[PDB]
Ligand binder design. Structure first.
Ligand SMILES: NC(=O)C1=CN([C@@H]2O[C@H](COP(=O)(O)OP(=O)(O)OC[C@H]3O[C@@H](n4cnc5c(N)ncnc54)[C@H](OP(=O)(O)O)[C@@H]3O)[C@@H](O)[C@H]2O)C=CC1
Ligand SMILES: COc1ccccc1/C(=C/c1coc2nc(N)nc(N)c12)CC(C)C
Length: 186
């Protein structure tokens, strides 16, 4: 299995969701960035795996569920089996990552992408080892009811460049935003 990554888009007040949807109006090219990053596999004959919590899974419109071209794994301790359209169910993040090393998945999975929500991000971000964060900074405040955890910049270094990620300011629907990549290894 390849690298472990989190990806998120976040407002200036750290918001990631409101009422089960995003705090901002749809940013088409921002979503295209998310799909491109999470789907593109560096290794032939492999797909990337996306890990998400239950409320995040159900926040994706049925139309767009499962995320195509990726293995979709949902985290829950209530569900007895994967939701309609999902591929895997795990009871904990550690369980999911352990699963990636089973015969079933060990040679099928390239990158692992944690795609939310807040508690899954927090656990990933505090777990020792090599991890990147792909963060889109939406450069305005938006009313939110779910938030991204604190990024400890003692340990997460902002990279000065990364292939395939534009470095300049983007703007859609009058909303400026920019792309960042952080990396820790502890
Ligand atoms: N980039 C962005 O801007 C993103 C926005 N979002 C948004 O954030 C919101 C959903 O996020 P949030 O409310 O944090 O919810 P989650 O997606 O994290 O879902 C929470 C449910 O997932 C299960 N769960 C979460 N973590 C674990 C774990 N480690 N082990 C087992 N089960 C787990 C629990 O289910 P159970 O009770 O069944 O055990 C929990 O009640 C929506 O608003 C969505 O739009 C989501 C991701 C990214
Ligand atoms: C239109 O995006 C959504 C709309 C409704 C419900 C969920 C999402 C998603 C949230 C994001 C998770 O990490 C993300 N990272 C980035 N850079 N952008 C995103 N948009 C997401 C993408 C699928 C999971």
């Amino acid at each position: 299995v390849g690298s472990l990554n989190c990806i998120v888009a976040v407002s200036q007040n750290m918001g990631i969701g409101k009422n089960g949807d995003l705090p901002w109006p749809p940013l088409r090219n921002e979503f295209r960035y998310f799909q491109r990053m999470t789907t593109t596999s560096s290794v032939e004959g492999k797909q990337n795996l996306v890990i998400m919590g239950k409320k995040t899974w159900f926040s994706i419109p049925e139309k767009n569920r499962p995320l195509k071209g990726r293995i979709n794994l949902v985290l829950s301790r209530e569900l007895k089996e994967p939701p309609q359209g999902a591929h895997f169910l795990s009871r904990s993040l550690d369980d999911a990552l352990k699963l990636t090393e089973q015969p079933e998945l060990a040679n099928k999975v390239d990158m692992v992408w944690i795609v939310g929500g807040s508690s899954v991000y927090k656990e990933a971000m505090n777990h020792p080892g090599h991890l990147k964060l792909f963060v889109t900074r939406i450069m305005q405040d938006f009313e939110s009811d779910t938030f991204f955890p604190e990024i400890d910049l003692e340990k997460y270094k902002l990279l000065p460049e990364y292939p395939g990620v534009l470095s300049d300011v983007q703007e859609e629907k009058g909303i400026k935003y920019k792309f960042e990549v952080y990396e820790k290894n502890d």
